Amino acid sequence: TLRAAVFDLDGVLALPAVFGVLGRTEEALALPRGLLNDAFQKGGPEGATTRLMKGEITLSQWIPLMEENCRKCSETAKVCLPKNFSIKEIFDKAISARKINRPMLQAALMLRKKGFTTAILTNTWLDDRAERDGLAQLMCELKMHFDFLIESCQVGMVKPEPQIYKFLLDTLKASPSEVVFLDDIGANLKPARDLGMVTILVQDTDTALKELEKVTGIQLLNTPAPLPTSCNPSDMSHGYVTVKPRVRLHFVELGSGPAVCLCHGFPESWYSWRYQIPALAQAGYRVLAMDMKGYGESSAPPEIEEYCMEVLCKEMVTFLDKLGLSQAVFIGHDWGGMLVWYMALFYPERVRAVASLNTPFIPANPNMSPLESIKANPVFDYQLYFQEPGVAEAELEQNLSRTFKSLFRASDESVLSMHKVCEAGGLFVNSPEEPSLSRMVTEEEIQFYVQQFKKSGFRGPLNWYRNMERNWKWACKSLGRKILIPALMVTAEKDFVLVPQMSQHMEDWIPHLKRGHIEDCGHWTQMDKPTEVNQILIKWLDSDAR
Amino acid sequence: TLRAAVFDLDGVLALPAVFGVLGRTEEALALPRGLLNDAFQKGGPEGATTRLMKGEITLSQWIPLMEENCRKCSETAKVCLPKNFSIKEIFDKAISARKINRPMLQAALMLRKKGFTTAILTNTWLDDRAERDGLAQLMCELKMHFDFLIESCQVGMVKPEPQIYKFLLDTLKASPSEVVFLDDIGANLKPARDLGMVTILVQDTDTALKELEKVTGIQLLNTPAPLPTSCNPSDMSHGYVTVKPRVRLHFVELGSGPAVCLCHGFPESWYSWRYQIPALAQAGYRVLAMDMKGYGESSAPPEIEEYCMEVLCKEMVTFLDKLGLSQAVFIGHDWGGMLVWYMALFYPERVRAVASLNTPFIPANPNMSPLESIKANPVFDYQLYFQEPGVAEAELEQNLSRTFKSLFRASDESVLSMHKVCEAGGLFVNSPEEPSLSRMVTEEEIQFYVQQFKKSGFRGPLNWYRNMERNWKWACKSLGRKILIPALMVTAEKDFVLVPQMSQHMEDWIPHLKRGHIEDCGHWTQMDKPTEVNQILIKWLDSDAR
């Protein structure tokens, strides 16, 4: 029956409410009880406040009117306002104090996820104060989570006027009885109730959610911790930079603030960062999530040498040049992890800070050929398998859904070991035709990857693995250096290829290296433990790159 | 004969030179003459400094070695270094003191423009200091101007070793006698001279340029003031945001820092900002130069209402939402100018600051229909001509080269008046078949526009002019407001359609409005007077939006 949920901003999706600062200020300042609320409402339907809420005037135009109102209210109450009494001040403070009420947001999210149409309906103002960015940020963070945002000052109507609920219903394409509406002000609920909408009077959040659970029949309270916000590909800004004649790089871009360049591993995608992209932007960074050369909408030239580290690095520098970026923070995973360590060693002036997930920094051994190093470690056997052009291409391209469904697995689910892969004749020889879906990924998400790999296949990706010697020679040039810019190594307990212990000597080359560590996390770090990844990167960004 | 020019960084393209701080510091501190230069060079070919310049070690690794060297040099000179003597300190200060030597850069630019191949060849270091961004910025600003940048620390070779000049010559694809090489250090010139390259020993800039003028036979000194840097379209980052199902917006993006959204007029392009894009990025802003709806690589739906101001504005807000931008500075010209005034009035929380070139802010007249307002002013007659769908489309699309060559004219060149256009039967009825090229535009540049307008033609563009009534109704809602966020109006003396005097009452609606004014500037502001435009916007950005 119920198909839509409507939430207010003040006192429902964001707390403390601002009218609340009228009551608090009166008490803090020992003013006549209600004096500030009287001034806020002076003239009712035709007073300053309603003109504000309808968008006839801006907030700065309103401030002196409210000032006058307070003056007149105190005259009639025969008291004096304190020296320093400032409506600008009170309102600035209250508006910066108000924060998203997280459980109410998660309830909206949940309802939207079971197919509800959701909306914010709010009496609000055109905000032109010097400090407006504060509110602009809040609304941005909230609105993306809802089907509609209806603002009194944009539609020229205010609760409790009945025409706004008609506008609401019309925007929802729903009949009143299909709608639950939550508000902290009872007068604002009445016209919803008159139309036969279910209403909830929000005093404390938890009780309001209990009512909402009862009435929708969906669990909202005591729900497990949800995943971080993901990205929908067709809502992203897609960027394209040509770095040389046959090579154009694609990236997704979100946020403002210091530039943070995300470099995915093999065989992956910008989309592998779908959980960090919104969290890092929300945390105050400008996120550039690449398709690395060889993948997705980036070019994929066929030649092996096009993917040695030196070429790849110089290309990443050109990409900053063309974007007019003097530096970026570089964060890599797996192959992208190796690449950012090289950016740090060969282009520190362009790297604000460097972090790697899973991929440790290991200096080249100038006395031992890389192939020999590789044959020492049974778990790198899969790398020998990747050497002969065509062999791994044919197995990986044969059935893309099956490829990513076999690769993208949480630590308790594997179908493929990286163990004696050559001898077996390949990666999937002992895995099923139709693997079960990992808990880390939906069917939709697998199909995104499938579709990306239909453009270029696995030649480009596999080429990253085919410059052992050439990378070894270039890396040898860096053996006298150390990495002395800010650096974070994040180890994954259950990555059985890039094991935590392989990172154990890193402090010799990076004396001030910082660390994080994630337990019960396999190789696909960002999607396996997206909450822990976000929290470790934001903490390290805030303290080391900001 | 001469076909290439090679410049050093320190003491040639950037001044003061850093070895210069060794001499200065000695003098400032009353140290034994040359003590610091001795320490800088200790061990020569195998000393710390050469390993630095070859990229064996980073700058921070070098700092303690140079410290030791100074200690040993003073021991042997039997003096003591002052308390507080800090190589880190001296080097930080010197490296931030060094700035582009503008006349040397303009000489390189000029030579490149007459077809020289140009290069920077420099002995330099991998810079990993906390303050490295300073140098990263310099190199970025310089390198874009040259065909090659060759850095000792990247190629593992240093001047004066002969192998670097061979590497140089090989990079240039030129024989030694086709090359002029400038350096401030004579020892570094010798191996160039040995190979038969022309050399210039740069002491003072002007004399070095006199020598360079003599030897290339091209005027470099006392040249008129050059245009600002322009953009090459295929070197830009191209961004694409879908703002609703049939509407995707394209923009070009350059720089980091506060977001600055550039909105072009009718019938124009992101490319109309080609002169401001690099200058604003260089000045510390993140430039987003739009193709506005209807143009270039943005979508161009056919329906008239798709281009009323309300839809256009809401779309620009969505574009910030999807980019994760809580605000941007909005700078408009002509129609984009009108649009940003509306952004200011209807979305001040999203507008950090607003500026318009040519387009004044005039409040709707609630008592007079817009059509009547329009018929009052003979100079708006061209707008009546634009109303009937198809008519102006057919004339404007008939011959694109002729269209833009007729439209884009400096104030002393016009072929078309905006005068009794309806009566005449159109815009070009009294203009030539093949107009002469304006001084403001090359043939290449016209052809860029031609090619952009081949995608969608003039229906979308013309539609901007076809919502007089609808814009009038929406604007009426804003008649109680004022614009109280930072605002700049730039008038153009010789725009005979958007005349300076039409902006004369603006302080009534925008009390703290700031102004600039450009003389002898026609309607095509950005390309007519690009130097004056850049200087007025950067000054206003720095003081009001930063």
Ligand SMILES: FC(F)(F)c1cccnc1N1CCNCC1
């Ligand atoms: F097959 C596979 F993709 F290689 C792979 C499969 C499973 C686990 N880890 C893998 N690797 C990713 C590439 N770098 C080394 C680790």
Ligand SMILES: FC(F)(F)c1cccnc1N1CCNCC1
């Ligand atoms: F033809 C033309 F494009 F309209 C035009 C031609 C010449 C000068 N100014 C023009 N206008 C540009 C559009 N807005 C009004 C001014």
Ligand SMILES: [Mg+2]
């Ligand atoms: Mg409320």
Ligand SMILES: [Mg+2]
């Ligand atoms: Mg020099």
